[PDB]
């Protein structure tokens, strides 16, 4: 695949898209 | 965290599934 | 505020402006 | 879930904001 | 909920999360 | 250009993309 | 109207365009 | 405008309800 | 990874996640 | 194609990957 | 219309809007 | 290319036209 910069609503988009049914956490501050 | 590996740095979409539950 | 009709990707973006920096946790039904 | 009554039938952002950290 | 900066294709799409059937009006003009 | 199928939060992003600066109104039926 | 046109059939940019300021 | 409000600065969601119709 | 269901532009989406900056070719029947 | 079996049925990114230039 | 500036995901989103059908490519390589 | 035209530059519609098969 590829490595780029992901940030805000696109890093969650990119997580829903890798995580889907497992479901993750989007938690910022660390 | 997330931010910093994936949006001031730059991540994979193999880095990305470390946030998955 | 009105009530939403929100699926796949859509959820995702609706938490991530509700909760901005909190961060949030997208969890899925089996 | 969350998720499930989003989409099947409706949600408010007020149920959403239980789901921030 | 949060402030969060809320840019362009962004902005609108949080309108149409916060006004949805209302209706909204984007004027960046002012 | 095509013709278009757009539901929900999509009228909003081609709204946003036809008017650019001008800005545009969104008004659905009740 | 164009908000319901545009999700039940289809509808054209320059349909879309009557909507701009 | 909103985008001062908001891009420029940083506004709430009970902000934007001011752009509601 | 997990599969996907994508429809519309949550194609075009995808693609862009996947395919970085090698780019893509979106290319729909008829 | 990829394009209506990402939509009707499932598609993996494994499968996506091979529309990338 | 107008012109903007269109930039990564948004820039594929405003292909699929203008393509749809015909398809696309996305190449930022050149 | 597109990313200089439309991106780092500014296009129009119709300039994005170009990129259609
Ligand atoms: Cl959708
Ligand atoms: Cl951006
Ligand atoms: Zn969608
Ligand atoms: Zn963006």
Same mark, same amino acid.
């Given at each position: 695949?590829?490595?780029?910069?992901?940030?805000?609503?696109?890093?969650?988009?990119?997580?829903?898209?890798?995580?889907?049914?497992?479901?993750?956490?989007?938690?910022?501050?660390? | 965290? @997330?931010?910093?590996?994936?949006?001031?740095? @730059?991540?994979?979409?193999?880095?990305?599934?470390?946030?998955?539950?």
């Amino acid at each position: 695949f590829v490595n780029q910069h992901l940030c805000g609503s696109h890093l969650v988009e990119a997580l829903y898209l890798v995580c889907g049914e497992r479901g993750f956490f989007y938690t910022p501050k660390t | 965290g @997330i931010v910093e590996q994936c949006c001031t740095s @730059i991540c994979s979409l193999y880095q990305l599934e470390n946030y998955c539950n």
